[PDB]
Design a protein around this ligand. Structure first.
Ligand SMILES: *[C@@H]1O[C@H](CO)[C@@H](O[C@@H]2O[C@H](CO)[C@@H](O[C@@H]3O[C@H](CO[C@H]4O[C@H](CO)[C@@H](O)[C@H](O)[C@@H]4O)[C@@H](O)[C@H](O[C@H]4O[C@H](CO)[C@@H](O)[C@H](O)[C@@H]4O)[C@@H]3O)[C@H](O)[C@H]2NC(C)=O)[C@H](O)[C@H]1NC(C)=O
Ligand SMILES: *[C@@H]1O[C@H](CO)[C@@H](O[C@@H]2O[C@H](CO)[C@@H](O[C@@H]3O[C@H](CO[C@H]4O[C@H](CO)[C@@H](O)[C@H](O)[C@@H]4O)[C@@H](O)[C@H](O[C@H]4O[C@H](CO)[C@@H](O)[C@H](O)[C@@H]4O)[C@@H]3O)[C@H](O)[C@H]2NC(C)=O)[C@H](O)[C@H]1NC(C)=O
Ligand SMILES: *[C@@H]1O[C@H](CO)[C@@H](O[C@@H]2O[C@H](CO)[C@@H](O[C@@H]3O[C@H](CO[C@H]4O[C@H](CO)[C@@H](O)[C@H](O)[C@@H]4O)[C@@H](O)[C@H](O[C@H]4O[C@H](CO)[C@@H](O)[C@H](O)[C@@H]4O)[C@@H]3O)[C@H](O)[C@H]2NC(C)=O)[C@H](O)[C@H]1NC(C)=O
Ligand SMILES: *[C@@H]1O[C@H](CO)[C@@H](O[C@@H]2O[C@H](CO)[C@@H](O[C@@H]3O[C@H](CO[C@H]4O[C@H](CO)[C@@H](O)[C@H](O)[C@@H]4O)[C@@H](O)[C@H](O[C@H]4O[C@H](CO)[C@@H](O)[C@H](O)[C@@H]4O)[C@@H]3O)[C@H](O)[C@H]2NC(C)=O)[C@H](O)[C@H]1NC(C)=O
Ligand SMILES: *[C@@H]1O[C@H](CO)[C@@H](O[C@@H]2O[C@H](CO)[C@@H](O[C@@H]3O[C@H](CO)[C@@H](O)[C@H](O)[C@@H]3O)[C@H](O)[C@H]2NC(C)=O)[C@H](O)[C@H]1NC(C)=O
Ligand SMILES: *[C@@H]1O[C@H](CO)[C@@H](O[C@@H]2O[C@H](CO)[C@@H](O[C@@H]3O[C@H](CO)[C@@H](O)[C@H](O)[C@@H]3O)[C@H](O)[C@H]2NC(C)=O)[C@H](O)[C@H]1NC(C)=O
Ligand SMILES: Cc1cc(N2CCc3c(c(C)nn3C[C@]34CC[C@](NC(=O)[C@@H]5COCCN5)(CC3)CC4)C2)c2cnn(C)c2n1
Ligand SMILES: Cc1cc(N2CCc3c(c(C)nn3C[C@]34CC[C@](NC(=O)[C@@H]5COCCN5)(CC3)CC4)C2)c2cnn(C)c2n1
Ligand SMILES: *[C@@H]1O[C@H](CO)[C@@H](O)[C@H](O)[C@H]1NC(C)=O
Ligand SMILES: *[C@@H]1O[C@H](CO)[C@@H](O)[C@H](O)[C@H]1NC(C)=O
Ligand SMILES: *[C@@H]1O[C@H](CO)[C@@H](O)[C@H](O)[C@H]1NC(C)=O
Ligand SMILES: *[C@@H]1O[C@H](CO)[C@@H](O)[C@H](O)[C@H]1NC(C)=O
Ligand SMILES: *[C@@H]1O[C@H](CO)[C@@H](O)[C@H](O)[C@H]1NC(C)=O
Ligand SMILES: *[C@@H]1O[C@H](CO)[C@@H](O)[C@H](O)[C@H]1NC(C)=O
Ligand SMILES: *[C@@H]1O[C@H](CO)[C@@H](O)[C@H](O)[C@H]1NC(C)=O
Ligand SMILES: *[C@@H]1O[C@H](CO)[C@@H](O)[C@H](O)[C@H]1NC(C)=O
Ligand SMILES: *[C@@H]1O[C@H](CO)[C@@H](O)[C@H](O)[C@H]1NC(C)=O
Ligand SMILES: *[C@@H]1O[C@H](CO)[C@@H](O)[C@H](O)[C@H]1NC(C)=O
Ligand SMILES: *[C@@H]1O[C@H](CO)[C@@H](O)[C@H](O)[C@H]1NC(C)=O
Ligand SMILES: *[C@@H]1O[C@H](CO)[C@@H](O)[C@H](O)[C@H]1NC(C)=O
Lengths: 733, 734
């Protein structure tokens, strides 16, 4: 009863079948007729007929995206599916909308296809449609033919996306039930009062990319004739009273009509990035019309050739009473004065100030104290001295890593020009708990006084610098430091690390890619609180005086020793690792042998990662050395034989990864498990399986042990003989 | 008579034998007894005896450096039989002691980077002819080097003595008065006394660098003196060195310079004071009035940690450096260069080079450079300007600050690696007549309009590499009417035709896959176009037949580089539309499966065809029918498995054929049966899977009958089959 070729999984009392990226030539008839959702994306399927989904009558969702990785769909192929609600047909080279789609459809996605006609024959009959995605069809094409009144009969439509299509005009006769209307990059130069007149339930309106300002967009940018902007009529948004989201990014706007927001009291998110609104930021009457706006983005609105000394912020910015986040990237200015941000200092909700990519030379950091409730001060990329389903115009990822921001106030001074930490670097700064000084080419010799103005930093990111930590007092002024990131500080590597033992609350230390090959005077690393140490990209092969380099880390539960060019680990060096370790990574090394007997001195070890090595042999009695190892990763190794009693005896082993190895077969004695095992997963893909009659004993064990899940069955391929080469080991006599 | 394993060459009426990097287990006895210089460096030679260089009596120079490559056992008097031996190089050989019994004729002995801890009279005092003695990197971080008292005293002809990177502690006593150059860098010499350099009146160079060092990214161990102490030079230590021209005092942790050191030093030409703490000495320094004949002054990397002053403090006494030609002031670390800061340098007549690199300078008043007598190089790289090897000099930048091809045009200004994100309207106002300009690596995203370089319009060589510039406007850079060399490498085209003198254009790694409106490149003067790292595969296709004659407009073109364009196939019409005037064509590092050799008939001046790093299989039968001028054909790293009959013959102009790293198993009788004479002076065949059976005999006979055709790297032309010949050279068979 092992499912092939899909991975069946009961999700929330509904069996779903994952069948993506499996090189399938056609829709398989070996899919369980009890499944509700089927995902056949990224396959080589070229034909869909009325007999493709026969028997699967309980199918509510079908995914056929990127097939073949054109797709020939016959009329009424999906018509037999009465319970079909969601159908995804993205990137299939469809020349027209499939005729004869089931009436039950509520979600239809026909993104990035060759559909140039939106006709009533394939749309008007689908009255249940709530979400219709028709983006990237007639994109760079000679205009999309939208039949007059094609959307009018779809009285249940809540979302209509026609972005990245040559439209020229807003389609007439749109259903009043619309809540989200996406018309980005649709070549719509004019918006009239009649275009969005009957849409009172509209919460989102996307008019971005129409008359665009070109700025490294991953799609063609062709600006309007003579630097013209989008022409929105004064009363074009007088009926959209429920509008919460308005996207006018890249519309070459120079003037903003305040009358657009008179009958828009609920506007929550406004995107005006990639425009020419420097003058509107300085005076703007529209700022007094947004009392409930929480996110305002005015990024990349700079005037070419203009590098002003200060940013001109209108006094009307004090009227944005609900403002939580202000994005002012790419304004391009030289100095941030205390009186420049006066209109923002009394806003109670303002927690995020985004000033990234502004080429600011000086900032009066005392102004940040005068703010009501700032939590994120993003100043990355400044000159301070000592996918069709994504948002294309606005940064969606967090400005600061959530693990850093959770500690408290965050300041991001990364990619700046702080080549050394001056004595006044952090004077007059609020109580900063998260600090990012990444990629500053900082070559500071740390002495223990550089962070005295902000001593409550709990998360310090110093990655991509050339810092000096020879002094045992380095960073010790930060007595509450819990996370220290010193990745990519390989320039410095006397060579000391004695500062680490002074911290009373240091939990995570990352010393990755520091190329540490030598340690002067003190050769050991000590700490009573350190829980995780990342030592990847270093030279442990040269180090192995360093026999007990990590023994001092008594509280250590996680250790990463990957990418250290380790050919062999001395037996004494392995025994000197912290006994408290619960997770050890020694992946991507050159280990020829591994002494499994030494695992007896690690009673809490739950994860042993030995991937990307050159291991050959395995121990006969692993149960005698481990009684806690729950996960063993051994992928990309040279193991050619599984020993007798390896799968058995180790009761704690729940996940064994033997993929990408040299296993030709698994004999009867190797899998003759005398005792019961809670092994819930076994990865075996990428092995050169000799598919002769010898593999039959392993195949029998797969049927007798259905609890042991073997993922990627299509990738567990036979190497020999010629008649079975390429085929899965589960599909044999 | 084909030399093996060395490449014999008569250089200036003297036959020299190059035998380096050839995996030789021992010194070969198959070296011509008529050679004068022998280079056996980078080999696996482990033993040298008196029967190693027998018969080679005319040997004047022997190079045995790096043997074995990654110790060397030399017996006593091994080189004693060589009466004409003058130069002997024994660097990096793990020699535990100086070889006993060296020939008396030796004038140049180099024993660099060895395990020599004793400089004894047994191996040194007998060599009275020695003029140059190099003993560097021997007892480097043995407690101290044991230099026998008076070991150098008998060497009355010694002009150069190098004892750098050795634990010396003290300057060796009894040095010959004939010394002209004394190198004592990184020798742990904390104190210099009056008696240390007393009897050396002919000394022209003195190296005391790295003694009490200031640590700064040095590729060797740096251990500073106790309590931050500097080198202690006595007041009268240099009172007898009247002929001193070169003084290296770099990395000596100096804080004060005694002016009395230069009182009896009127010829001091080069002074090195980089990597010290002389910020205060630069601001007041009494020593500046003692150097009237100094031409090169280096005060780089003398910054005070934590100190970022608003201006550089230059002493008024800098006006006393009347012979100054080059001033190096890198790593001072300051914020502004004002007009009145460099006033003491403005009336010096010889001052042509000002080096202000790595200074973190935020703003410079560029009008001050006009007020200089004769500036030719203004090096401002690695600053914050905004819109509007044991045989090398370790502490000094020996390579040219500006590329000589750029500097030759005239005044050069290097503003690379600065914070100029866009060219402001006042960027170049008040600048001298700049003929060479470097604006590389500035992250410059300027949309060029034809007015950005109006203040400096006589720029002949413009370097704009590693930027993000926009050249859509046909007026871009056209204000520079005398532009001859334009470098736009790594900036990932109607402006090109406006230039009347543009000779070299480099558009490498711009990833040009599409051209809007005008699809062709035109120019009447362009001689060389570098189009590597672009997307010619996308441009050339049976759908968008718009870029079929993309380079036809370049009528004066003689050199074209089309490498790294991912070309799998070149359309026949696209190849025929290339400039007929081409004399050098590079299509290397592509994915070409086929090459239509017939099309070479439309290129009568083509002398070099580079087709390396491709996947070519087939060659034409009658190449002479298509070419009558191809002098060099490079075909290395290809899948060619057969040489056609009459390929080597018929093409009289072919002087260099490169068939190395291919799949040639053999060269049959019909393939090399040359009916007509040839002027083929070179044939590279290494890296081929040569089937060394009796079939290779016909090719071996041709090698003896054609000695004029030189086959380089004979040790690398290795047999693949059979097992008994695998690894051996094809020339060493029955
Ligand atoms: C103009 O500005 C507007 C905003 O003012 C932008 O609108 C947003 O566009 C993006 C991209 O199209 C939308 O993001 C996607 O939303 C989908 C639906 O979200 C709902 O359902 C999920 C649960 O499934 C909830 O968690 C969520 O809160 C919503 O209730 C998601 O399914 C998408 O997620 C998937 O794709 C992304 C990207 O590949 C992955 O990162 C995810 O992990 C996941 O796989 C996605 O998040 C967004 O919802 C729109 N906003 C609104 C309010 O509707 C326009 O895009 C912008 N125009 C341009 C051209 O930039
Ligand atoms: C220097 O070294 C440090 C320490 O290793 C690195 O920082 C850690 O980076 C990892 C990712 O590489 C972080 O781990 C991730 O955390 C995410 C957020 O955690 C929250 O949500 C989870 C639930 O999902 C909670 O359990 C948790 O308590 C938090 O509330 C997780 O969502 C991530 O999970 C995903 O990936 C892992 C595999 O990495 C899978 O096992 C999961 O199933 C899931 O798919 C992930 O765990 C970690 O939090 C960071 N630690 C710190 C202290 O910041 C630095 O990145 C490194 N620096 C450099 C430059 O390399
Ligand atoms: C302290 O400061 C002094 C200067 O006052 C430095 O001295 C120089 O040191 C370098 C390196 O040791 C010397 O450079 C070498 O000179 C050799 C001899 O040069 C003469 O002969 C050649 C012809 O063979 C003439 O062209 C030349 O003008 C001289 O007449 C050269 O043979 C060397 O060249 C070879 O090596 C280099 C480096 O690998 C290659 O680039 C070359 O192509 C070639 O293969 C080399 O140029 C220099 O001569 C010294 N100056 C003086 C005046 O003698 C100290 O080095 C410095 N100390 C420290 C520690 O930095
Ligand atoms: C963008 O593209 C341009 C054009 O290709 C590049 O600039 C050229 O770079 C090459 C090197 O890559 C330069 O060529 C070298 O010039 C040296 C100096 O030339 C003088 O001396 C020679 C005699 O040696 C005279 O014949 C000549 O007329 C000059 O007076 C030569 O010494 C070099 O020769 C050595 O290398 C070549 C192989 O490259 C060997 O064949 C020689 O035997 C010898 O070993 C060499 O020829 C060239 O001068 C540059 N041209 C210009 C206009 O500057 C840019 O570098 C490139 N930009 C980037 C970033 O890649
Ligand atoms: C401190 O600031 C630095 C610099 O802004 C932050 O580093 C950046 O982190 C992001 C997210 O981890 C990286 O983005 C991703 O990079 C990968 C790899 O190139 C790319 O494939 C993704 O599309 C995405 O761009 C970004 O590259 C990285 N930049 C650098 C220079 O390292 C860092 O995360 C900040 N730290 C904290 C604590 O917030
Ligand atoms: C204009 O300024 C740029 C930036 O300084 C110059 O480029 C630099 O040129 C030098 C010499 O060609 C390069 O140095 C060498 O680079 C190789 C490769 O990394 C390295 O192996 C050598 O040891 C040496 O460092 C240097 O890397 C290169 N830098 C950059 C960023 O390209 C350029 O030559 C100047 N142009 C003119 C006309 O002077
Ligand atoms: C007033 C004005 C502004 C201009 N802008 C052009 C460049 C730019 C601007 C903004 C905003 N974004 N961008 C793109 C980029 C951001 C960071 C960068 N650099 C880096 O990321 C690296 C990181 O590492 C240190 C060195 N810089 C890579 C891309 C450098 C420009 C402003 C221009 C252009 N022409 N004229 C006349 C201008 N006039
Ligand atoms: C007054 C003062 C000066 C200091 N210095 C340290 C760094 C430094 C200085 C000088 C001179 N040289 N160096 C090295 C380096 C040059 C260019 C660089 N960066 C780059 O090459 C790259 C390339 O272009 C893009 C980004 N920078 C790489 C290496 C950035 C420093 C001055 C220090 C240190 N601690 N304290 C308290 C200081 N106090
Ligand atoms: C669909 O599911 C129901 C239970 O929800 C079941 O009774 C019915 O037989 C299923 N139909 C098919 C075709 O599997
Ligand atoms: C401030 O934010 C809180 C929610 O975090 C919200 O309840 C409150 O109304 C906001 N203040 C204003 C003036 O909008
Ligand atoms: C904070 O800002 C207000 C204006 O909003 C100003 O009156 C006050 O003086 C500022 N406080 C400080 C300490 O500068
Ligand atoms: C090391 O740090 C301590 C504490 O700040 C300081 O006293 C000492 O001078 C520092 N060492 C050096 C050489 O700067
Ligand atoms: C060990 O680590 C845990 C988890 O971070 C922490 O609670 C505990 O205090 C640490 N032990 C000591 C002795 O610091
Ligand atoms: C494993 O380590 C122990 C202790 O160092 C040693 O006695 C034993 O021989 C090692 N076993 C293997 C297989 O190398
Ligand atoms: C050395 O060269 C001379 C000619 O310069 C020649 O007469 C003599 O025979 C040569 N000696 C040897 C051993 O080759
Ligand atoms: C200036 O340089 C020339 C050689 O270029 C030299 O003859 C002249 O004496 C120098 N001037 C001084 C004052 O040294
Ligand atoms: C040039 O420098 C001299 C001092 O050496 C100064 O007097 C003169 O005014 C300067 N010339 C200009 C035009 O600034
Ligand atoms: C192109 O350059 C010309 C000449 O300077 C200028 O008139 C024109 O405005 C430029 N084009 C743009 C779009 O800036
Ligand atoms: C062609 O190039 C040569 C060499 O640079 C140059 O002398 C000649 O003037 C150029 N021809 C024309 C017509 O510009
Ligand atoms: C070479 O090019 C000519 C002209 O385009 C064409 O007729 C001929 O067939 C080609 N030869 C080969 C070998 O492809």
């Amino acid at each position: 009863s092992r499912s092939y070729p899909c991975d069946e999984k009961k999700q929330n009392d509904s069996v779903i079948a994952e069948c993506s990226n499996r090189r399938l030539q056609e829709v398989p008839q070996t899919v369980g007729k009890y499944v509700t959702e089927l995902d056949l994306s990224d396959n080589f399927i070229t034909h869909i007929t009325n007999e493709s989904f026969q028997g699967l009558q309980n199918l509510t969702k079908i995914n056929l995206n990127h097939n073949p990785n054109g797709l020939n769909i016959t009329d009424g192929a999906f018509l037999n599916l009465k319970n079909l609600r969601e159908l995804l047909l993205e990137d299939n080279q469809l020349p027209q909308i499939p005729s004869g789609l089931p009436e039950s459809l509520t979600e239809l996605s026909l993104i990035q296809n060759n559909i140039y006609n939106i006709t009533k024959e394939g749309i008007s009959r689908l009255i249940n449609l709530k979400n219709l995605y028709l983006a990237w069809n007639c994109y760079f094409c000679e205009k999309t033919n939208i039949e007059d009144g094609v959307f009018e009969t779809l009285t249940n439509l809540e979302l209509l996306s026609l972005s990245f299509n040559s439209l020229s005009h807003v389609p007439p006769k749109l259903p009043s039930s619309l809540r989200k209307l996406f018309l980005s990059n649709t070549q719509i130069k004019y918006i009239s009062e009649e275009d969005f007149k009957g849409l009172i339930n509209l919460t989102l309106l996307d008019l971005s990319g129409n008359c665009p300002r070109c700025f490294n967009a991953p799609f063609p940018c062709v600006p309007c004739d003579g630097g013209a902007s989008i022409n929105i009529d004064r009363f074009a948004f007088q009926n959209l009273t429920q509008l919460r989201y308005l996207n006018l990014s890249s519309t070459s706007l120079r003037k903003i009509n305040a009358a657009w927001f008179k009958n828009m009291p609920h506007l929550k998110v406004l995107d005006l990035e990639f425009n020419y609104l420097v003058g509107e930021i300085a005076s703007g009457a529209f700022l007094t019309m947004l009392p409930r706006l929480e996110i305002l983005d005015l990024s990349f609105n700079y005037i070419k050739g203009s590098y002003p000394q200060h940013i001109n912020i209108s006094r009307n910015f004090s009227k944005l009473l609900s403002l939580r986040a202000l994005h002012l990237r790419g304004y391009v200015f030289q100095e941030l004065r205390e009186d420049d941000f006066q209109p923002l200092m009394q806003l109670p909700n303002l927690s995020t100030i985004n000033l990234g990519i502004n080429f600011i030379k000086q900032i009066d950091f005392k102004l940040f104290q005068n703010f009501s409730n700032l939590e994120i001060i993003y100043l990355s990329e400044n000159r301070i001295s000592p996918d069709p389903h994504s948002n294309f115009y606005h940064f969606t990822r967090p400005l600061i890593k959530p693990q850093c921001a959770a500690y408290g106030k965050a300041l991001d001074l990364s990619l700046n020009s702080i080549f050394f930490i001056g004595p006044n670097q952090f004077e007059n700064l609020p109580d900063i708990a998260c600090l990012n000084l990444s990629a500053n080419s900082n070559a500071q010799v740390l002495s223990g006084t550089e962070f005295s103005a902000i001593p409550h930093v709990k998360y310090l990111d110093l990655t991509n610098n050339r810092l000096d930590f020879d002094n045992a007092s380095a960073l010790t002024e930060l007595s509450d430091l819990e996370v220290l990131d010193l990745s990519y500080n390989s320039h410095y590597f006397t060579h000391h690390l004695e500062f680490i033992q002074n911290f009373t609350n240091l939990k995570v230390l990352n010393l990755s890619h520091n190329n540490i090959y030598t340690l002067t005077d003190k050769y050991n690393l000590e700490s009573k609180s350190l829980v995780e140490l990342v030592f990847s990209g270093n030279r442990l092969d040269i180090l192995w005086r360093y026999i007990s380099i990590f023994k001092g880390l008594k509280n250590l539960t996680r250790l990463d020793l990957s990418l250290n060019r380790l050919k062999h680990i001395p037996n004494e060096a392995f025994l000197n690792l912290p006994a408290s370790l619960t997770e050890l990574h020694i992946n991507d090394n050159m280990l020829k042998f591994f002494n499994w007997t030494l695992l007896q001195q690690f009673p809490r070890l739950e994860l042993l990662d030995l991937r990307g090595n050159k291991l050959l042999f395995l121990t006969d009695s692993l149960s005698d050395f481990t009684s806690s190892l729950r996960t063993l990763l051994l992928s990309h190794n040279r193991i050619s034989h599984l020993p007798s009693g390896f799968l058995s005896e180790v009761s704690s082993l729940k996940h064994l990864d033997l993929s990408s190895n040299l296993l030709k077969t698994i004999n009867k004695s190797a899998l003759e498990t005398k005792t019961t095992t809670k092994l819930s997963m076994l990865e075996l893909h990428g092995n050169p399986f000799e598919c002769t009659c010898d593999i039959g004993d392993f195949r029998r064990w797969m049927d007798e042990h259905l609890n042991v899940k073997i993922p990627r069955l299509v990738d567990v391929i036979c190497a020999s003989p010629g008649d079975q080469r390429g085929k899965s080991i589960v599909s044999l006599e």
